[PDB]
Paper text:
Because the protein had been crystallised at an acidic pH (3.4–4.5), we decided to search for a new crystal form at a more neutral pH. Trigonal crystals diffracted at 1.75 Å resolution. The interface area between monomers in the trigonal crystal is also 389 Å2 but there are many more hydrophobic contacts on the monomer-monomer interface. The side-chains of Thr62, Leu64 and Leu66 from the β-strand D form the core of the interface. Because there is a clearly higher number of hydrophobic residues on this interface, we assume that this interface is more favourable in solution than the dimer observed in monoclinic crystal form.
Lipocalins are typically small proteins (about 200 amino acid residues) composed of an 8-stranded up-and-down antiparallel β-barrel and one α-helix. There is a hydrophobic cavity inside the β-barrel capable of binding a hydrophobic or amphiphilic ligand. Bos d 2 contains a central β-barrel composing of eight antiparallel β-strands (A-H).
Numbering used by the authors: 6 to 156
């Protein structure tokens, strides 16, 4: 059960995982450094602020994802995406994204944090969510360690 009151916040991304790992490694289009999620009209839309890093340059973007059904949203960004908020707590948010780039479908997750770094229970929860959705835990990338764009 998703509590929409917990969705908004100054989130940072710790981990991402994808079946097509090339999408989320450094230089990949779906390696996105979160800064903020804002709910618009009671989460009818999510306004998501994040950085892309390209050739050493930090690109600060805000993209708006529109509600499709429940907490599944849609946005065009390097292809057609659905983005689902699959877990949210006071300190953790996990997304599940399906991206179609005209050639491949990519299934991926993002593990976002507030406060201190992911605990062991948070790490395990993230891996369990991945396994439930067929996203390989062997394809987990640590994003926070390469996030050197402005706070």
């Amino acid at each position: 059960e998703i509590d929409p009151s917990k969705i908004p916040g100054e989130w940072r991304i710790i981990y991402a995982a994808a079946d097509n790992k090339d999408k989320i490694v450094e230089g990949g289009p779906l390696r996105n450094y979160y800064r903020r999620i804002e709910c618009i009209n009671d989460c009818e839309s999510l306004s998501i602020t994040f950085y892309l890093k390209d050739q050493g340059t930090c690109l600060l973007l805000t993209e708006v994802a529109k509600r499709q059904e429940g907490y599944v949203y849609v946005l065009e960004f390097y292809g057609t995406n659905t983005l689902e908020v699959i877990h949210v707590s006071e300190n953790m948010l996990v997304t599940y994204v399906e991206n179609y780039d005209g050639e491949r479908i990519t299934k991926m997750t993002e593990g976002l944090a507030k406060g201190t770094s992911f605990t062991p229970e948070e790490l395990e929860k993230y891996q369990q969510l991945n396994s439930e959705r067929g996203v390989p835990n062997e394809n987990i990338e640590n994003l926070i360690k390469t996030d050197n764009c402005p706070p």
